[PDB]
């Protein structure tokens, strides 16, 4: 019986939880009334918060079921650990420990390694396990290069391009993005930026797309600079330089239909394309599709040498 610790940033399960989620992200400070209202507005804008938290649940559940289905050596038990939403990462480890689990494999629902989004989760998780004792966690650190994951996006892209009208297919620009982070991660030699660039190349060459670019999105609002250029500005600058008739957005850094994709892409990036008279394209996110789950299953099994 092995533990399967699945971690992610987290999304509120109920609208009544939006505020605390914000506080947690703001590290103890409740958001300003307007600031809070502006987040609530965005969730409504995309159809409600309700569906979002369910996707992460289905991903972990399906991953557990598939891993236990494709091989008979190990029986996995999934535990969700989130950064800003209960069950928190430390709560999930505590529960694995309480349940008697002595060995566990963890994986973050973000393909690129970064200090802020993968290393900090693994660290928090392992430190809690050590404090409890008798629980050893083996952590997946990056999987953006897993061929089945790359293939997933390559196929979604080939399809989008093959469904475009003639004019666009010859004047389209592919934008591969991930969640931006403070530039100070460089102080730690964080390869996050490099992994994104490689992720973009792998997908572009796989789909046979030659015109593509790398951008960042969803940066937080702090006094420090964040990884740029932002997808919105990148789209404008690229249009100004070649007048592309279409932009295809691949938020490879994200795995589900969350706020960053449904809003920051489907709304804010479409605002830019609409403004410049270009079509907007954004292939389906992995969510809990079997093709994606099989990719994660292979990633976990490989980490275990199986
Ligand atoms: C899911 C994509 C993502 C998000 N944040 C990070 C990532 C990887 C990382 C991060 N977001 C960050 C940080 C910490 C930056 C730091 O250490 O200063 C990381 C690693 C926080 C941040 N994020 C935001 C703010 C305003 C801040 C600063 C909070 C403060 O006032 O202290 C904004 C959000 C929000 C809405 C609350 C979301 C959903 C969110 N951030 C941008 C997205
Ligand atoms: Mg924003």
From Swiss-Prot:
Catalytic activity, as annotated: Fe-coproporphyrin III + 2 H(+) = coproporphyrin III + Fe(2+)
Record GO cellular component, one term: cytoplasm
Superkingdom of the organism of origin: Bacteria
CDD domains reported in the protein's UniProt record: Ferrochelatase_C (cd00419), Ferrochelatase_N (cd03411)
Residues the entry annotates as binding Fe-coproporphyrin III: 9, 26, 42-43, 50, 121
Residues that coordinate or bind Mg(2+): 16, 42, 264, 268
Localization per record: Cytoplasm
pH dependence: Optimum pH is 7.2 with Zn(2+) and protoporphyrin IX as substrates.
Impact after mutating residue 83 to A: Retains 92% of activity
Reported regulation of activity: Stimulated by Mg(2+). Inhibited by Cd(2+). Inhibited by N-methylmesoporphyrin (N-MeMP) and 2,4-disulfonic acid deuteroporphyrin IX (dSDP).
Pathway assignment: Porphyrin-containing compound metabolism; protoheme biosynthesis
Consequences of knocking out this gene: Deletion mutant requires hemin for growth.
EC number, UniProt record: 4.99.1.9
Keyword Magnesium attached: yes
Keyword entries, A-Z: Cytoplasm, Heme biosynthesis, Iron, Lyase, Magnesium, Metal-binding, Porphyrin biosynthesis
One GO MF term attached to the UniProt entry: ferrochelatase activity
Positions of N-methylmesoporphyrin binding: 9, 27-29, 179, 184
HAMAP family attached to this UniProt entry: Ferrochelatase
Subunit (UniProt): Monomer. Interacts with frataxin/Fra.
Function field: Involved in coproporphyrin-dependent heme b biosynthesis. Catalyzes the insertion of ferrous iron into coproporphyrin III to form Fe-coproporphyrin III. It can also insert iron into protoporphyrin IX. Has weaker activity with 2,4 disulfonate, deuteroporphyrin and 2,4 hydroxyethyl. In vitro, can also use Zn(2+) or Cu(2+).
Protein's name in the database: Coproporphyrin III ferrochelatase
